[PDB]
Design a protein around this ligand. Sequence first.
Ligand SMILES: [Ca+2]
Length: 641
Amino acid sequence: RHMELSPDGNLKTTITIGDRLTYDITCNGRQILTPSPISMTLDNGTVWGENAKLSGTSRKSVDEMIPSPFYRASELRNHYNGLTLRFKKDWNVEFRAYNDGIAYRFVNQGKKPFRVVTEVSDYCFPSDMTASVPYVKSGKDGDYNSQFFNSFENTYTTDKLSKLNKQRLMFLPLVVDAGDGVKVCITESDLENYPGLYLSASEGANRLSSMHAPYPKRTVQGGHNQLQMLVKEHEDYIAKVDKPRNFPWRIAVVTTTDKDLAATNLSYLLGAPSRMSDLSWIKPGKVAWDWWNDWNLDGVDFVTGVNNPTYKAYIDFASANGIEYVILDEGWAVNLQADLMQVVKEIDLKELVDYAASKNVGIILWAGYHAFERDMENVCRHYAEMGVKGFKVDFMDRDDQEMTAFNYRAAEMCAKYKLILDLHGTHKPAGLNRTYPNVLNFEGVNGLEQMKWSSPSVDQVKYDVMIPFIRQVSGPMDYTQGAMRNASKGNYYPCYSEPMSQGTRCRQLALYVVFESPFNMLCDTPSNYMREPESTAFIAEIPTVWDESIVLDGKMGEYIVTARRKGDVWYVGGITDWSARDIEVDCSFLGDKSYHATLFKDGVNAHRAGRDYKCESFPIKKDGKLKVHLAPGGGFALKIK
Ligand SMILES: [Ca+2]
């Protein structure tokens, strides 16, 4: 029995080494997590955790700053008390107690190669608490191998642990409401070459249990235009290990106010350190995206589509407003060939890249999984040398050891040729952006692309106020916002070629502050942006990377207000759910000089016409108390310079 407390002493975990290896969690004297078992089963029969044999322990207290480029601040504070448990048989379990979380990880110091059959990571709660979880969207109930093949894109289901579907997996992160304002957010970081952790309500009462996708023994090409490698057969173990190594951290974020949940840096702090020395070539920025708006420009003299004159228009729009990139989404490579070297007749990559270059615009290429990793080294070298700045690799739809290994290999391969990377059709970041700073964004989020086909029952507005406290806890999101067509309550309808967002114009603007996206999209058509000078100017100028971030206030699934600083310029964004609300922005975070503010707030009719907004300018200072009204599904965006 070993105790460890957070630096402020209000969060503690008791670890017991008995017939089972368990750890609980107590917050301000209240037990929010009952003793929960953890273990790893090897192919040789060994089971770390079962009647474990303790050989030694070492404690430590650390307080330092971790550099965090292309993220929410220049650096993040790493403050905790660590407890490492060494066990007879060359294996350890490291425990850390931060003021906002308890985390642990298995460490393999053994020198002999072996395999992991299964891993146990239970979360036993003292009562039937209300959980907010993202179910795996595909597959059928009970057929877990059917579920392992998924996009990791889904809204949240909020219900009591006892009422959760006991036959459907839940991916991370997820939250459990411990009551009395306390929240527990479960996630994992440093997910390199190891299967992703799913949670299940299939076992016991008030208990979430883990499960991992088995190792693949036979994969076949197929899926989305033959760009996917489906797992047809799997091994009887989840992971291969042939060197000493740290295993992924299992993180239990614990907060007493929702704003601390949205602000927690645990995911990044627990990611494997950066393996990059030179970062001067990594350029974060925005994209005059093409796909979301379906190339649907109007007011032009040529037929739009995946062709040269269309991308020239996107490049010109981007350049005209200082926007950094233009992505050539799915369509530039001959379909079904899964060959990145076969460009369509209508596209002249070389001409586009060079034209873009003369306009100070970088080019990013979209690539389906298989077509990219089948000849990765050659692809990265070839396009890097012709001028391409990076890739958007999509449709992995897997998180078994081989795929998670891929994420890091691609990250490294891109880094080698000075290319940035954006991963789609993937799972939560889990620290990868710290290890390889060139991976500027990750999907694994039910983004605005869903508005192209979702039925009105999909509550995007509600989702927006959920993810800042859940999915974003794991890392950056490529949500792809920026819609100029805005639907107030009941006016939304899926429109593939002329999509809209739910809520108001200012909600869209606020997301550029509320959501963290180093590589950020301007989802709408340049045509729509040019019809909206004021909105476009605000979006084009706002940073995607920051020096300092402060979540001013918030309640999960209800609202959030966040202030971020870039140099000496401050930005504040706020959003609400379908309920209108009045927020007060205390500007005590400002410096001493006199500032000029530019505010975008919902128009007085934003509740009936979502596009309705009002722009205002006025002087403001450190003592200012800005009162702002947010319409239903609305929000506000503020610039203080
Ligand atoms: Ca997607």
